[PDB]
Design a protein around this nucleic acid. Structure first.
Lengths: 92, 14, 92
DNA sequence: TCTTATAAATAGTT
DNA sequence: AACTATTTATAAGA
């Protein structure tokens, strides 16, 4: 972008909405590419500020969600805090 | 656990 | 990158694995930023080629999945085909 | 809503 | 597993 932004809540509603649309498409496009490049199945569930649901699935949402329910093994689990901790670890 | 249970419960029934 | 790659499955196992790890972190980072910039809640479920599960949630995976189950409305739903169709809509 | 200057992600090398 | 040159994504303008 023209300028580096801080990761913090956008106050201007229009800007936020504009950002939301563009970055969501951005995010789904990165997920498409990941799913194709590395033969992955991916599901993505987003609730905006207005609790409206936006979903993406590489192929079929219900297939992924059920396979999720069948999973019984300890696996990788990440949250915003993990990501933030991982970024502080390496700035350069 | 119970959440996994509840998810499968609602995808099924469709 | 050093070169433009085609979006198509990577055959070299090591490359694929290397790409997978980097792009997954990439994807989770974009998800964190979306969730903070636009005050949205996000869950992400990935099954790799080996059907191993990797998951991310902005805050709490179980909270998002339950709110998903409670959703009772037509919403936006996208697949790889939508993305690919939209990439012809754009271009240059 | 487009366009583009600049920031951020990443493919290939080593 | 580093590094960086290049590609990609995107913030701010218009």
């Amino acid at each position: 972008g023209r300028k580096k932004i801080q990761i913090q809540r956008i106050t201007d509603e229009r800007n936020r909405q504009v950002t939301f649309t563009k970055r969501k498409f951005g995010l789904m496009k990165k997920a498409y590419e990941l799913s194709v490049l590395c033969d992955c199945e991916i599901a993505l569930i987003i609730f905006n500020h207005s609790n409206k649901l936006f979903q993406y699935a590489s192929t079929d949402m219900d297939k992924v969600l059920l396979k999720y329910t069948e999973y019984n093994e300890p696996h990788e689990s990440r949250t915003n805090a993990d990501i933030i901790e991982t970024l502080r670890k390496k700035g350069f | 656990g119970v959440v996994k249970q509840k998810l499968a419960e609602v995808i099924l029934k469709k």
